Amino acid sequence: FRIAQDVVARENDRRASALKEDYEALGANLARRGVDIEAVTAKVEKFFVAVPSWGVGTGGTRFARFPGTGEPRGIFDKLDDCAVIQQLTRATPNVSLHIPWDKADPKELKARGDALGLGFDAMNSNTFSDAPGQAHSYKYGSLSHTNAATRAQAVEHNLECIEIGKAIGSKALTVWIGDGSNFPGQSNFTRAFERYLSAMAEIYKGLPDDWKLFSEHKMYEPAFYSTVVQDWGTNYLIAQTLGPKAQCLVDLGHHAPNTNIEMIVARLIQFGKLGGFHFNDSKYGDDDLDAGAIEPYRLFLVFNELVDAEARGVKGFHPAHMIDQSHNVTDPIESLINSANEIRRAYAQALLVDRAALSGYQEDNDALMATETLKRAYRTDVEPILAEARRRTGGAVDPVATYRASGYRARVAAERPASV
Template sequence: MTDAVRAALRAQRIELPSWAFGNSGTRFKVFAQAGVPRTPYEKIEDAAQVHRYTGVAPTVALHIPWDKVDDYTHLAAFAKEHGVGLGTINANVFQDNDYMLGSVTNPDPDVRRKATDHLLECVDIAAAVGVRDVKLWFSDGTNYPGQDSIRARQDRLAEALQQTYDALGEDQRLLLEYKLFEPAFYTTDVPDWGTAYVHCLRLGPKAQVVIDTGHHARVPTSSSSWRCCYARRSWARSTSTPASTPTTT
C-alpha cells in the first residue's frame, strides 16, 4: 500500500447510520441481541466508540422517529461531548398504518398532509442542530393495475417535495433517495434514479439524488431511467438552474 493510498484512507469520512447499532437480521426476522443500544444517546455512544477506533466516522445520521427525543440540541451537545457530530436527518414515511396506500402520494389528502408535515419536521430538526442534509426515501407505489393514477401520484410527490424544498434553510440540502430493487408489486413512485433526478432538477440546486448502492446492483442503469428523464421533461424546463448529478451512499 502506497503512502498516497494510506493518506486517502485516513482522509475519508464515513457517516454512520444510527440504526446500524440496533438489532439486525433478515427481511424475515430481526434477532434480538444483548447489549444493543436502547436510546439515541446509547447509539451515539457506540458510534463514538467506532470513531475512536477508526478515526474516519465523525458523524452519526439520525432516523426520525426512531431517534426522536424531546431536545435535539441536547442530543447534539451529547454527541459533541463524545467526539462526534450529528449528520443527515432521515425521514420515515413507510411504517405508519396510514401509509398503506402511500405517504405523500396517497390519494387521501389528510394522509398526504400528515406525511408532508413529518418531512417539514425533519427540516426543522436539521436546522435546530445545524445539520445540512435531510434525506427522503419513499416506499410509495401501487400493487395492482387501476389502483390509482400513476401520473397523479407523481404530481402529489412533486407537491410534497416542493413544500419541503421551500422550507430548507440557505445552507441545507434535500436528498432524494432511490434504492435499487425496492419495488412495489405493480408500480413504484420513485422507480429509478431518473425519476429522482427529474424531481430534483425541477426543485433546484439544493436538491440532489442519492442512490443506495447497498441493494445488490447487478446490471448497469437501464434505458428506462433515461426514458423517465424525458417523460416529464416539462418539469426540467421550469427551472434554469442545473441539478446536481447523482451521488451514492
C-alpha cells in the same frame, strides 16, 4: 472514551512491527510506480462516511429478527456505540439520525454528540411506517397519497425533521419513501408522481439557504409492482424540478439486476445532481449487506467515478456519503467498522489509478490496457495505508481485533436490559 486508550495502544503496539514492514514495502512499490504513499495516506485519513443511527442495532427481515446482546435501548445508546466505530476507524465522525426513531431534545442530542466527538449528518424522515397518534396511515402512501390530508401530514413531518436537524448541525434532509403499488391499476403512475412532486415542492420551501434535499430512488420493496421513485431517471426529474438545493442519492442495492451503477453515478455528476452515495453490498436485491463483502470491484468502480470527477475538475462537488446497512447476523458495531474500512479501501485504490496512462489508453481505444490500468490500482493491497491512517489519527491498526480485546460488547450487554 468508549474504548480504553490503553487497550488501543496495546493492540497497536502488538501490530506495529508488521505494519512498519508492510507499509514501507508498499511505499517502495508505489514509489517505483510514481506514487507517493504519504500523499495517499494523507487523503485517506481525511475520507469520511456517515454512519446510520439505525445500523448499530441488529436488523432483521419480515421472517424474523435475531437480536444480539447489549442491543442499544434508544438513540443515546446508539450514539455511544457509534462513538466506538469512530474512535477505532476514525472514518465515521458523523451520525445520520432517523425521525421519529431518534426523536429527543435536540440540545441533549447535540451535547451527547459533542461529548463523544461526533457530529450529525443528513436527517432522515420516516413516512414508510405509522407512528402512534397519527391522524392518517401511510399504508397506501405518504407524500404521493391520494388523500390531501395524508400528504400534508407527511410534509409536516419532513419539515419537523428539518427543524431538528437545524438545531443539531445537520445540513440536509434525506427522503426515502415506500410509496408505490403492489397491483397493476392500483395507482395511476403519473398522478401519483404529480402528487409526490407537489409535496416535495412544499418540503423544499422549508429548506435553509445552506441545506440540501435528497430524494432516494428504489426499484422495489416495500412496493412490489411499482414504486413512485423507482429509479435514477425519475430521481433526476425530481431534483431538476425542485431546484438547485435538490439532488439524488444513489443506494447501491436499490437497482435492477445487472444495472451498471457506476454509470448512473457518472451521469448524475455530469448533470450536477449527485447528492450522495449510500454504501452497502448486495447479490440479490436490496440486501443491505456490509459494503464490499460481495462485489468489492464494483465498489472500486464507483469510487473510480468519484475520483475521476475530481480529476476532471468538477466544481462544487461535495457529495454526502453514508452507510445504509442492516446487520442481521453479526455484531452491528463490527460490521459497520469493516464496512467503513472497505469504503476507504476502495477509495484509496481509486486514488492509485494512473489517470495519465488511463486517458492515453482511452484515447487510443486500447481497451485491454485501460482495464489493466484500473486493475493495477485495484489489485494493490492498501490495508497498510488504511492501518497507518488509523494509527496517526488515534484509531486502531486492526479495529475489530481491538474492539474484541476491549470486551465492549460484554460490557454493554450487562448495562442494557433486553426488551421483553
